[PDB]
Amino acid sequence: LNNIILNLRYRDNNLIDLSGYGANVEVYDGVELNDKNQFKLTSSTNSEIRVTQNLDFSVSFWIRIPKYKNDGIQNYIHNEYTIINCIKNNSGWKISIRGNRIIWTLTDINGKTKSVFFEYSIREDISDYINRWFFVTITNNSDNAKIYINGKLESNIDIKDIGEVIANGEIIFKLDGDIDRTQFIWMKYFSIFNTELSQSNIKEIYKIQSYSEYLKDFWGNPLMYNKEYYMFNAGNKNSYIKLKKDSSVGEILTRSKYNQNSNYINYRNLYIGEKFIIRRDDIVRKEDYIYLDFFNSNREWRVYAYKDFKEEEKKLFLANIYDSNEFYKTIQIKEYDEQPTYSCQLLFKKTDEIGLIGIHRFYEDYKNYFCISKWYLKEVKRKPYNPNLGCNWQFIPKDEGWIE
């Protein structure tokens, strides 16, 4: 898969063509860049990238699209805006977004237009897509233009009506349309191929570009130390952790949802439960030894596991930071899943294995509690790794792309 004509990648604090065809790439001052290959497009005049290139072609990239402002839903749903435009003599292609939709458009020499789109729901309790890094691939031959999302075919339309399409036009990365000053788009790994990629090729590219040295947060950004995170359980999506009133255990409650009338939108709240923080660059990696802490009022507390553990599962101990011979404190963060994910696991060790952190039904009538469990130790070795297991967790920081 060297069939790449443009490969925009980070190098020496700049975005450049690493294809070997050496396209001229101009990044303007208003674009934000990091060494993790992310670049942000804002509403500012000088937030653009300009590419001067040197029917059977493909375009791949990742994207993180901000959640709708609850008060401005109508603009969101109506107002379309271009993010990438490649035109010459009024002919070429453009990638545009209209609310919860991403749109691919081809225009021929005679101004003839056909479009294909992907629409993600804005009524889901927990969305895989909203404000989260996901993978987009767009293939084109003589017959069909189709969109693949995270390696899976989603959309497909016939284009045999369309005449000649001049696709060697200058590529402008820029927000264009009826946009709020607040509007932004994150993108990474923008590539053009001179062939229709197969589904097999795209699953392989998705899995390659899914890998990183470091663990990731809920949004698909790198998991950090000394950073405040709400906690998400992949096995119990609609649950969260709350400290039991004036006690030392973590009870599991159901997330609240959107309250206002507007029946265009539904979601569960993410900024609910205790604000956790991971203790020992400030980047969290596989097999790292950590302390899992949280803030109780304005004092930093800790998640401990009781060393007297004859039962298969037991409630975790939430208390002030204090060394006790009765309690395990050292957790090792794990990534058992071989397939793409933002989930990690939490393993208490002494070097034996005591149990994994999860959620379980304890009797008192029954109730759900934040627990260690020996059960998970066997399940994580089974293949394929089950992504809906209770021992799979995700960290949600505050993000300007998600206001609730």
Partner: peptide, 14 residues
């Protein structure tokens, strides 16, 4: 303070 929390933890374990 830690003691008073550990007891409450023991009460929950019951």
């Amino acid at each position: 303070a830690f003691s008073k929390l550990k007891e409450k933890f023991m009460n929950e374990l019951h």
